[PDB]
Amino acid sequence: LICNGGHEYYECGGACDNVCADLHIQNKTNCPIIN
Amino acid sequence: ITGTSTVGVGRGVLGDQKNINTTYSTYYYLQDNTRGNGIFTYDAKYRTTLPGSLWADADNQFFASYDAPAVDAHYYAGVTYDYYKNVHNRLSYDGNNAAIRSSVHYSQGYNNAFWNGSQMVYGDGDGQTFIPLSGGIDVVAHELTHAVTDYTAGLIYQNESGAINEAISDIFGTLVEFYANKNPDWEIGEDVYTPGISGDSLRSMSDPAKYGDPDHYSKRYTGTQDNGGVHINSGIINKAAYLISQGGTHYGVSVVGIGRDKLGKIFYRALTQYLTPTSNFSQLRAAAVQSATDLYGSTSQEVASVKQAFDAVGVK
């Protein structure tokens, strides 16, 4: 919650964020992690 | 590794003693050669590298606090394997005896567990709202059931197909919990959630509304959060599955219970024969009705109870 560091937001969502280092394998919408 | 098949002893997350199948080669490894091509349990050592190190122990005694998540991940993977083999004649998650790999101590304060397409992974929890998640047999079986679904129906993890994906995991998670027959219930994750609240859980199949999940199609979530509500709308299917097995009256609609074994048979056949990656809730109904027809005949109580259960939750 709050998530106020800029260009971010809170959700109870999927396991993957967009991370510069990992964008080539996974992102918010292409996430192989199944909870 | 290659060594001699041994039986070690340890204590799980909830402090219960159990025997675990290990492999001895200099160290005792959490490698169970008794089930298919093996069940292997790894230490992620508070990091996110996967799978991490195959769990190695000096003396085949796993009674340290640090050992407890590994004991349960390993043991409960075994139980889940036995369930699919003994009940559904399915050999591991791929039906071809794929090795079952699990990693524990993933990251730090990590309040979740998953299947990543290759293996199961368990956080330790933050210790206040979760304890190590491999402590719940339903949670373990839920994650491995995601692998089953992957290899069978391929239910896309979004929107209604994704909620079906989720419900299938909760249904079989629960049926594995009952199969082990320690402390079974129709709740999800009770054994690893909020160690300072008794009686609660992450989800309820018997009463999804207890935790704000819909128990009728008219209450379905249609927004984009949680991959289009996969862990929310699963309530609708979970409630239908609960009613099929146990019976009850739900928004005035009575359902005759046909029991857990027939529930599992109907849904396993649906999952393996009738569902596809794009299946929605109406298609799951048709799949479950056709499965019950194959298994029990058009005039059966079982067929009628599947129809009544989906009616009761508003899925036509």
Next chain:
Amino acid sequence: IRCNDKCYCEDGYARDVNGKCIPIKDCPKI
């Protein structure tokens, strides 16, 4: 087993080394 209570970068944005969400066009090679 459940959703993740997380901060996410907005679409178009991704975490740098600092953990800050920055435009994806400003991400480095890797």
